[PDB]
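Q: Predict the assembly, please.
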Amino acid sequence: SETRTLQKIREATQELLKYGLLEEASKPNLYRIVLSHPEEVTRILEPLDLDIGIDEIRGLLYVKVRLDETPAQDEWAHPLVRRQRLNLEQSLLVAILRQHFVAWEQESGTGASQAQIAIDDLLPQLQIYLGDPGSESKERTRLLTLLDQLKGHGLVTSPDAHERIVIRPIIAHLADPINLQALLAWLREQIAQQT
Amino acid sequence: SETRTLQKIREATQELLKYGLLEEASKPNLYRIVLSHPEEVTRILEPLDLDIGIDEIRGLLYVKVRLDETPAQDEWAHPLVRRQRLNLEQSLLVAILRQHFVAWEQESGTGASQAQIAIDDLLPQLQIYLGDPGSESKERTRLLTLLDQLKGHGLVTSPDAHERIVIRPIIAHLADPINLQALLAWLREQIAQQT
Amino acid sequence: KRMSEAKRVDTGALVEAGADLDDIPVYLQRLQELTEEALPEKLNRFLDYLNRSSDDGVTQLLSHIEHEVLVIEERLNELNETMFRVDFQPDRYLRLDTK
Amino acid sequence: KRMSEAKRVDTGALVEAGADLDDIPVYLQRLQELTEEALPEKLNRFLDY
Amino acid sequence: AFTLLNRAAGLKQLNSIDEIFRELVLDDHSAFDRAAEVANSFDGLTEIHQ
Amino acid sequence: FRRVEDSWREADRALRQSIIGEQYHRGDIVERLLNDQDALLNTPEGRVFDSFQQQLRQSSELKAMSERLRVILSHPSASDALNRLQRHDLRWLVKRLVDESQTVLQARARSERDVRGFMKTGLAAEHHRVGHLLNEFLNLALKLDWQRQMI
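A: Predicted assembly structure:
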């Protein structure tokens, strides 16, 4: 009975779902497909209690829960989305990258110039906030594990030959920036008092 | 502004996605919900390139990758499915289980899943193929690792207090004569290639 | 009447069938399958072999019990030896007995 | 078929008979026996106990 | 040894010698599961025969 | 008795491995069982085991032997003839055979239990079809490489 959703549409949708995101500058065709077909996309999400938020300048789409906040629960629970709590180190790096993305957006504008940095400078700051795991190379290993986990969470690109990375716009849209900023305040506070 | 799909339907479908399957014997509410709105589910899955198979004698529902245009290589290529393809030895255990499943199904009729087995019984049977590393604990570690992996595909409950597990009926559809014959032909092909 | 009666004793095969003229194929197919199995021919051998294995198990068990009793006896004699090292009462050492 | 089935379900009142029409009189004698004597008596005793 | 130690420290009953031996003294190797195995095999074979 | 165990363990392993052959009627498997047991019995190690078992019927002899062993190990000379360990083991010879025979009966019961479960296959139609499918698949399995983890 029902004719098939356009292959292009389902393709772009499956991309968006796998990565929870879509970037025009990297994969423009899926971004454009969704742009031409947002009503249908959201309708598809409508049963699943999903939806997409958009940022044209940063060139990103991202999924999001359609439900309202605390209509029948103290805290929203979506079966298909596990609310993972980033451990300490991940949250720390996230706060650093958040403020860095903000700073870069000041230095280059929002979205049109994606945030970028060389990994070297990050290692000292993060080691300061963390504590040496045993060596500088171990710092590199732990940091690269963190970068990989971010990248898996759609938050950074890989460190290239020069170990330069691009910070993904989803950080800008992250849920609780204030809690991360408070954690950063706690971190710098702890570092300052312990000397 | 826009209409809402029956919240109960949305609940049942998103849950059934989370589990990949849904049993009358456990959650008859959502199961009957789907039974009332199967075409609704179908439409919902079409963007997703998924489908509902049904087995009401066993009181089972279970998603299944749409076959229309999913890559000819394998339904497993589907971007959004996450767990890795089944493998050989796992399929070996699958065969053993299905054998027990059908045997007990005869002994008790094709009703709900009282299909219980005791782990110790598997040890002899599986011992013939994977061999005997001469340490009962080692083989139990092996066996439980396998079983675990199977429960990752949803086919089996993990051991209870009495080290008994019940066979998830989803196995039978994973192990219908068609799959058995196809895989069996492929196995003969592999024997030929090896010979 | 024959088809009915046989289905009366059946388990799992003739139950699917009726007791009428069109059912003969499955009836005789069952008879044929049984004859291939020749299963009733095993009778006496298997009765005797059951007697054998079960007699073995039971007797070996009535053994394993006895020898446990004698190991306990050895424990008792070890402990009688140990207690003989000391006096319980002025001219008296303590000893254990069993029955 | 029906008479043989009855002898199958039988508890010792029809098995003694054969499986042909001459037996049917005995079958239906047992039938009337059960209907009149067995059923009222036994239902009343069941509910009474 | 330690098992006997605790059973001894628990001699609140201060009961008779037979109990002393049977409970406190001798580590346990009663053959109940063995008898279960044997009767179970007997029944399995009776099933074969049946 | 070491080898007695090995032989009956191997016989059990064989009977299992062979029971996978769909070709085997119920009557084929029962015969294979009975013949495996008779063969393993008439072989020398089997003769040893059988002799031991027959002794257990006349338990008085074994018990008298253990008694006499105790009496012997009591004598002072024993200490010289045998270090502690040897005297220990000899003191408990009769047991260490009786217990060991149990391993035989465990293999026997294990075979018997497997064949009992197998032999109950009064399958319905479609179940019988898929059961043929499986038994086919499994006899294929018996010939594969289960050691190569990659495989």
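The longest strand of chain B covers residues 50-55. Helices of chain B lie at 7-19, 28-36, 38-48, 88-108, 119-130, 136-152, 170-174, 177-194.
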